[PDB]
């Protein structure tokens, strides 16, 4: 049986070892798509979401030099429209598209069974050299990333209602 | 097994760290579809043209031959602001020197070390190991000169000044 | 006359039973018949609702209603998959 959902059956594709496993797949989506593809997709969504929630808070905390003079009022999604008129978004888009090109090659290598989901070998600082502490940081990455997806959706949608932006909406 | 430049991707099987410049950097699998001797001689030729072109563009603004219609500093505009016939003569020169240099060969026919066309009249490569070091120098400065010349010529399309002129007066106070 | 190539992963799909093997569902080979039957009914109602909301089509329509209207033909293929899985014991 399933851990998270006691009435429902254990998901077939999911395994205990797969980091951030709670036996949570009520609709059986893991049966439809390749499990490694879903794992890479979740890990990528986690990392983008983490950056976006941190960015939302940071935009309320401060503003880089000169940004106050391109955009005055807009805080969360309004800034994107002003910046697409400029080269700021196009530039992020071009460089991220370039990084994702090698992400596509990484995905192809993963889907043949060689590489591991989310593993780009990017560990410059010595944070994973134990393989027990490494397992804790992997699970912490997934849990913080899932929290960050829910948060980023939460913050952007709150801006859609109010226009306040995250932390200022907290204040008022 | 794993590429030096890209840790997560597997090493391109073809490279084997033999040619100079092999940091395992072939992610898009271009060596599987074409012969690497042709690719290396192409890389060297592109880098040599780009090195000459970067140096030329830089000096055009700083020093120009003192004749009428040779005084436009901006490289891009100097193409149009020049006798078409004279540049056309240079284009025809590029043809003969090439046919004679490569002994009159095609893609299969060219392969002889790749890029070793023999035009080294002075004896710089005395030590063969110094030759190998100079080859590493040639390929790395050629790669830098490809990106650098592309970057300045697109600056010149943007700024309209030339390399050193665009660098010295870059508009910090607007987009 | 010469070997005819087919892509890797081509398998035998000829069936003479009551229902085809679940392999005919592709990526949906592991989905249960209850899940196809409920998804089929859901897709039929949502697709019909979204279709109904835009039958007088105008120059500016709601885009989501347009995309949701594509669920009506998709529901036909879903209930066919439900019949295939129920008769395969899934
Ligand atoms: C999904 C992520 C995301 C997106 C699309 C944006 C987009 C934007 N931000 Mg936000 N921001 C982000 C993340 C993001 N930021 C993060 C992570 C922070 C820090 C916590 C901030 C803090 C921030 C502030 C304070 C402000 C902006 C502003 C802006 C705008 C101007 C562009 C700019 O200068 O940004 C530049 C943004 C950065 C330099 C932060 C990026 C930092 C991440 C960590 C990049 C890391 C790359 C990574 C290390 C490489 C990994 C390699 C590996 C894959 C191999 C633009 C709307 C300005 C604005 O208009 O707001 C009103 C502004 O004032 N951002
Ligand atoms: C995409 C992001 C973005 C955008 C659109 C701008 C836009 C601007 N910046 Mg800023 N800037 C940014 C990111 C950005 N900046 C980042 C990430 C840095 C590095 C910290 C700077 C550092 C910077 C400096 C140091 C200065 C500007 C200045 C300027 C402005 C010149 C015209 C003017 O206001 O007078 C212009 C509005 C200039 C200005 O007028 O600011 C007072 C200036 O001196 N920028
Ligand atoms: C490594 C090469 C490289 C090069 C040549 C450029 C070139 C450029 N960038 Mg981009 N950029 C790059 C990498 C690069 N970028 C990377 C890696 C990032 C992080 C993702 C960005 C993020 C970025 C942003 C967010 C912005 C630019 C902008 C610009 C323009 C500078 C604005 C201007 O008038 O120039 C003069 C440059 C000065 C510094 C003087 C002030 C120019 C097209 C800006 C723009 O508005 O484009 C027109 C802008 O807002 N860049
Ligand atoms: C809370 C944030 C958090 C945490 C714990 C991690 C943790 C991890 N990341 Mg991830 N990552 C994050 C945010 C985070 N990441 C974000 C926001 C980005 C986008 C810029 C990435 C992009 C990224 C890439 C591209 C790669 C990793 C990798 C790794 C692993 C090794 C590096 C390490 O120990 O970092 C510890 C990090 C922190 C303590 C956060 C500060 C580890 C499981 C590598 C991996 O999976 O290989 C094993 C890898 O190659 N991360
Ligand atoms: C990290 C997760 C997270 C957190 C902490 C919040 C927190 C909040 N949300 Mg957000 N939200 C989230 C995720 C999150 N949300 C997600 C994933 C969505 C889906 C898009 C939303 C959509 C959403 C809307 C549409 C609204 C909020 C609102 C709110 C606020 C009041 C909700 C309340 O107490 O009454 C909730 C009522 C209950 C009965 C709770 C039980 C609060 C600041 C409201 C607000 O004031 O924002 C402007 C609001 O209108 N949230
Ligand atoms: C891709 C290469 C390239 C191209 C297309 C051009 C094209 C042009 N240049 Mg530039 N130039 C270049 C390289 C290039 N140059 C280099 C490498 C130099 C030496 C630093 C110069 C120095 C130069 C000056 C000083 C002037 C031009 C001018 C001109 C224009 C008229 C042609 C002329 O009179 O040439 C004249 C060429 C020279 C005086 C020197 C060329 C010497 C060669 C190319 C470099 C040494 C190469 C080496 C010994 C072996 C070469 C092998 C080769 C023959 C296959 C024309 C638009 C004129 C102009 O209108 O400027 C606006 C002008 O006044 N060029
Ligand atoms: C065999 C070698 C050779 C020969 C015979 C010529 C002959 C000529 N060249 Mg060429 N040239 C050569 C090598 C050669 N060049 C080389 C090695 C370069 C450098 C790569 C150039 C670069 C060059 C340029 C950039 C220009 C010439 C021009 C000329 C003409 C010069 C006389 C003139 O102005 O009009 C003769 C008529 C009159 C004086 C009557 C008025 C003439 C047709 C010029 C010309 O007129 O081109 C059409 C011109 O602009 N040449
Ligand atoms: C940093 C610049 C640089 C360097 C290190 C080299 C280095 C080399 N070149 Mg290249 N070359 C360059 C720029 C450079 N080249 C440019 C700009 C041109 C265009 C005119 C050429 C055109 C060229 C030809 C046409 C040939 C070479 C050849 C050679 C090789 C033997 C000679 C030697 O030791 O030259 C030392 C050179 C310098 C220190 C530059 C001054 C050597 C590996 C020869 C070879 O066999 O290729 C492998 C050969 O036939 N080169
Ligand atoms: C070695 C290569 C090289 C170098 C040094 C430069 C350097 C420069 N380019 Mg060129 N450029 C390059 C490659 C390069 N580019 C290539 C390969 C392209 C694509 C064809 C361009 C296209 C390009 C355009 C379209 C523009 C520039 C601009 C600029 C300037 C902006 C500074 C910057 O990058 O801020 C951004 C840096 C960061 C965010 C740090 C990370 C600077 C002088 C801009 C300019 O001249 O401004 C007025 C401009 O508009 N470049
Ligand atoms: C559009 C636009 C832009 C933008 C933008 C951006 C960044 C848009 C981002 C949109 C996002 C990230 C939306 C995510 C919403 C999350 C949802 C619906 C989750 C609900 C959870 C549920 C139902 C249940 C949860 C559950 C609960 C409670 C119980 C169990 C646990 C759990 C399963 C978690 C720009 C920038 C281009 C500007 C432009 O001008 C406008």
Resolution attained, angstroms: 2.9
Question: Is ligand 9 within 6 A of the CB of residue B160?
Answer: no
Cβ-based neighbours of B138, under 8 Å, separated by 6 or more: B44, B47
CB burial of A84-114 (b: ≥16 within 10 Å; e: otherwise) equals: eeeebeeeeeeeeeeeeeebebbbeebeeee
H or E element, residue A16: none
In whole angstroms, how large is the CA radius of gyration of chain C?
18
Which H helix or E strand runs over A3?
A: none
Among the listed residues B77, B71, B42, the one whose alpha carbon sits nearest the alpha carbon of residue B153: B77
Query: Does the beta-carbon distance from B7 to A121 stay under 8 Å?
Result: yes
3-state secondary structure (DSSP) of residue B10: strand
| DSSP for residue B45 | H
Q: Which two tokens stand for residue C45?
A: 């109602």
Closest Cβ opposite residue A12 in set C27, C30, C35:
C30
Residues present in chain C in total:
90
Mutation target among B2, B8, B11 for the A interface, most CBs of A within 10 A: B8
Instruction: Out of A86, A87, A120, name the one closest to residue B8 (CB).
Output: A120
Experimental method: cryo-EM
Q: Pull the structure tokens for residue A86.
A: 């400029």
Question: How far is the C-alpha of B67 from the C-alpha of B84, rounded, in Å?
Answer: 16
Let me know how many helices (H) and strands (E) chain A has, helices first.
7, 0
Residue closest via CA to ligand 9's atom 3 equals B151
Note whether C31 contacts A31, CB cutoff 8 Å. yes
Tell me how far the alpha carbon of residue A55 lies from the centroid of ligand 1, in angstroms. Answer: 6
Of A152, A158, A160, the one to substitute when testing ligand 10's pocket (max ligand atoms within 8 A of C-beta) is A152
Helix, strand, coil content of chain A in percent (nearest 5): 60, 0, 40
Tell me how far apart the 2 most distant CA atoms of chain C are, in Å.
56
Question: Which protein residue's CA is at the shortest distance from atom 14 of ligand 5?
Answer: A154
Residue in chain A nearest B10 by alpha carbon: A109
Decide if B175 and A87 are in contact by the 8 Å CB cutoff. yes
State whether residue A115 sits within 8 Å of chain B by CB.
Answer: yes
Q: Which residues share a beta bridge with B10?
A: B2
Helices (H), chain B: 36-62, 75-80, 84-101, 107-110, 128-159, 163-168
Ligand 4 contact, A133 CB (< 6 A)? no
By the 10 Å C-beta count (0-12 exposed, 13-18 middle, 19+ buried), A18 is classed as middle
Cβ contact A102–B6 (<8 Å): yes
Q: Are C79 and C33 a contacting pair, CB within 8 Å?
A: no
Tokens 């594709």 belong to which residue? A13
Task: Report d(CA B84, CA C23) in Å as an integer.
Answer: 68
How far apart (Å, rounded) are the C-alpha atoms in residues B63 and A153? 59
- SS3 string, chain C, reads CCCCCCCCCCCCCCCCCCCCCHHHHHHHCCCCHHHHHHHHHHHHHHHHHHHHCCCCCCCCCCHHHHHHHCHHHHHHHHHHHHHHHHCCCC
Q: Which two tokens stand for residue A140?
A: 């912490």
Q: Is A77 in the pocket of ligand 10 (CB under 6 A)?
A: yes
Find out whether C44 and C71 touch, Cβ atoms under 8 Å.
Answer: yes
Q: Do A33 and C32 touch (CB under 8 A)?
A: no
Q: Which residues contact A139 (CB under 8 A, 6 or more apart)?
A: A19, A20
Alpha-carbon distance of A93 to B57, in angstroms, equals 31
Residue of A77, A158, A168 to test ligand 5 pocket, by largest number of atoms within 8 Å of CB: A158
Q: Which ligand 8 atom minimizes the distance to the CA of B117?
A: 50
Distance from C-alpha of B138 to C-alpha of B43, rounded to nearest angstrom: 11
Q: Are C30 and A28 within 8 A, CB to CB?
A: yes
Residue B10 phi/psi, 5-degree rounding, is -75, 155
Report CB contact under 8 Å: A106, B10: no
Contact residues on chain B for A105, CB-CB shorter than 8 A: 9, 27-28
Contacts of C32 in chain A (CB under 8 A): 28
* CB neighbour list of residue C41: distance below 8 Å, 6 or more residues apart: C75
Which C-chain residues 22-61 have CB contacts (< 8 A) with chain A? 27-28, 30-32, 35
In chain A, what residues touch C35 (CB-CB under 8 Å)? 27-28
User: Which DSSP state fits A62?
Assistant: -
What lies within 8 Å, CB to CB, of B49 at 6+ separation is none
């Amino acid at each position: 049986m399933s851990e998270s959902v006691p009435f429902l059956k254990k998901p077939e594709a999911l395994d205990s070892s797969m980091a951030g496993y709670a036996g949570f797949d009520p609709l059986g989506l893991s049966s439809i798509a390749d499990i490694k593809f879903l794992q890479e997709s979740e890990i990528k969504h986690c990392r983008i979401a983490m950056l976006a929630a941190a960015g939302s808070i940071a935009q309320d905390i401060f503003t880089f030099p000169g940004v106050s003079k391109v955009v005055g009022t807009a805080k969360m999604t309004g800034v994107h429209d002003v910046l697409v008129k400029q080269g700021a978004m196009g530039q992020i888009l071009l460089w991220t598209s370039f990084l994702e090109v090698f992400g596509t090659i990484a995905l192809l290598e993963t889907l043949d069974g060689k590489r591991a989901p989310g593993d780009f070998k990017f560990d410059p600082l010595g944070f994973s050299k134990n393989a027990e502490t490494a397992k804790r940081y992997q699970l912490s990455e997934i849990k913080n990333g899932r929290l960050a997806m829910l948060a980023t959706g939460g913050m952007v949608h709150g801006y859609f209602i109010t226009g306040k932006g995250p932390l200022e909406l907290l204040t008022n | 097994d794993m590429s030096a430049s890209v840790p997560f991707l597997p090493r391109p099987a073809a490279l084997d760290g033999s040619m100079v410049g092999d940091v395992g950097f072939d992610p898009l699998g271009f060596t599987t579809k074409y012969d690497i001797k042709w690719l290396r001689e192409s890389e060297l030729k592109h880098g040599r043209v780009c090195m000459l072109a970067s140096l030329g563009c830089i000096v055009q603004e700083i020093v120009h031959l003192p004749f009428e219609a040779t005084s436009n500093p901006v490289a891009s505009e100097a193409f149009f602001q020049v006798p078409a016939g004279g540049l056309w003569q240079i284009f025809a020169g590029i043809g003969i020197v090439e046919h004679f240099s490569n002994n009159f060969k095609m893609s299969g026919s060219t392969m002889r070390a790749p890029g070793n066309l023999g035009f080294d009249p002075l004896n710089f490569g005395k030590n063969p190991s110094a030759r190998a070091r100079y080859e590493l120098a040639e390929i790395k400065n050629g790669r830098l000169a490809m990106l650098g010349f592309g970057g300045m010529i697109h600056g010149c399309f943007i700024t309209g000044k030339g390399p050193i002129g665009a660098l010295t007066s870059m508009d910090w106070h607007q987009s | 006359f010469s070997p005819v190539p087919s892509p890797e992963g081509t398998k035998e799909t000829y069936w003479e039973t009551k229902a085809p093997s679940s392999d005919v569902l592709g990526i949906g080979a592991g989905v249960s018949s209850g899940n196809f039957a409920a998804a089929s009914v859901f897709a039929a109602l949502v697709g019909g609702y979204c279709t109904g909301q835009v039958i007088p089509l105008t120059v500016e329509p709601n885009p989501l209603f347009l995309a949701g209207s594509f669920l009506l033909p998709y529901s036909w293929a879903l209930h066919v998959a439900a019949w295939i899985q129920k008769n395969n014991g899934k």
